[PDB]
């Protein structure tokens, strides 16, 4: 049976959808999978747990940590994570040597959006390289266009006076392009660009999205183009929130249907002091029920990407006033279970794509609060094109004040404003079901890929 090797780049937002993708490969298609895990230090924590309790058809190899101690502590995350894959190639080659010895040379090597240098090892071993793309078809289009964009545009992107509007894509202002594009002199941009120039080497790109969610972008991506690999929407691949977990879910059990606003800023997002304070005050002001996963504030929006009690940062009396109607949990919540809970009615999110898909699958309307990476691009998509998210208004200084927090929260949870998005998410919840049926468009696309892999293995062994 084909053996697929999956090489994620660091980040829970990459490992989680890759684990869901692997489970579908083994359960639906009878393949075997090995995760090969690169890291700049020892594996977490959450990494070992997400890779725990998987069918025996899925194994994990943790590589020796690579040495990135030569890098500035101010190095951007995208540099760190791309380099982690790049510098792990020697160790990845040893793993592929063991696969050859075990009669299990992979049929494909699947990297994610920042791990294309692993293609060097795939090519050396005559293994087809593929990318699993954990974010939108809109942002995939941007990555595919980036080599041309880079060539044709010579200013920093924030200086563009017209928005970029790729075929089938929501327009995005240069100042809203994903964070690592925002400083072309930084190695974050060089690693972004380098990765995108390698996309044409992929035999196919599987994207965690679905037709009804991004119909125009998907149609455009699937049109033949110069050096453009085939693109397969295979989503939404999410944890549907049916696994066994506690205190926050007990609290949730005691709230009315559709009444709770879940608030979470991903696996690594934080707010500034000033913004954390205004958000807290606005949540309390709103008088809505809320479940907030809280991290300590920082001037760096992705500072917990990979300490202090976050509750010590909350304003005077905040925990007292909200003691019944609000549940504040430090660091991490069982998000899949929360979004699937009947008492959840809304989601204030950083627009991480896994959180977005989870919310879609459960029909939970959003407040779009982007922080870093490509989240702003996602927010513009979700609010202006898909129309399943409301956006808060930020002042000219970039702060979303308590009045606006309370306005948008009430608007989502009870207002006319929130009716449009709530209806839209209902339609998307239904379409998310449709596409993953035996003959749904996402299942068909994944099936075609798995069929290609089976045929490749067949021709090789015979
Ligand atoms: O308290 C918590 C918090 C999160 N989780 C789970 O962690 C995953 C969060 O992934 P998500 O894509 O929303 O955010 P993040 O990891 O910041 O995204 C990066 O990777 C994403 C994929 O490329 C990208 O769109 C984004 O911009 C990047 F920043 C998602 O499956 C949540 O259910 C949880 O269980 N409990
Ligand atoms: O998962 C990611 C996806 C994207 Cl598009 C960026 Cl820019 C950064 C991270 Cl960490």
Curated annotation (Swiss-Prot):
Active site: 14, 112
Keyword Transmembrane helix: no
UniProt note: phenotype after gene disruption: No visible phenotype under normal growth condition.
UniProt keyword terms in alphabetical order: Detoxification, Glycosyltransferase, Transferase
GO MF assignments: hydroquinone glucosyltransferase activity; UDP-glucosyltransferase activity; UDP-glycosyltransferase activity
EC number: 2.4.1.-, 2.4.1.218
Residues that coordinate or bind UDP-alpha-D-glucose: 267, 332-333, 350, 353-355, 358, 372, 374-375
GO biological processes: lignin biosynthetic process; response to toxic substance; xenobiotic catabolic process; xenobiotic metabolic process
InterPro entries linked to this entry: UDP_glucos_trans, UDP_glycos_trans_CS
Binding residues for UDP: 267, 332-333, 350, 354-355, 358, 372
Catalytic activity, reaction form: hydroquinone + UDP-alpha-D-glucose = hydroquinone O-beta-D-glucopyranoside + UDP + H(+)
The protein's enzyme class: transferase
Consequence recorded when altering residue 14 to A: Loss of activity
CDD domains per the UniProt record, alphabetical: GT1_Gtf-like (cd03784)
Cited Gene3D superfamilies: Glycogen Phosphorylase B
One Pfam family per UniProt: UDPGT
Family as reported in the entry's similarity comment: Belongs to the UDP-glycosyltransferase family.
Function: Bifunctional O-glycosyltransferase and N-glycosyltransferase that can detoxify xenobiotics. Possesses high activity to metabolize the persistent pollutants 2,4,5-trichlorophenol (TCP) and 3,4-dichloroaniline (DCA). Also active on benzoates and benzoate derivatives in vitro.
Protein name according to UniProt: UDP-glycosyltransferase 72B1
Species annotation: Arabidopsis thaliana (Mouse-ear cress)
Name of encoding gene: UGT72B1
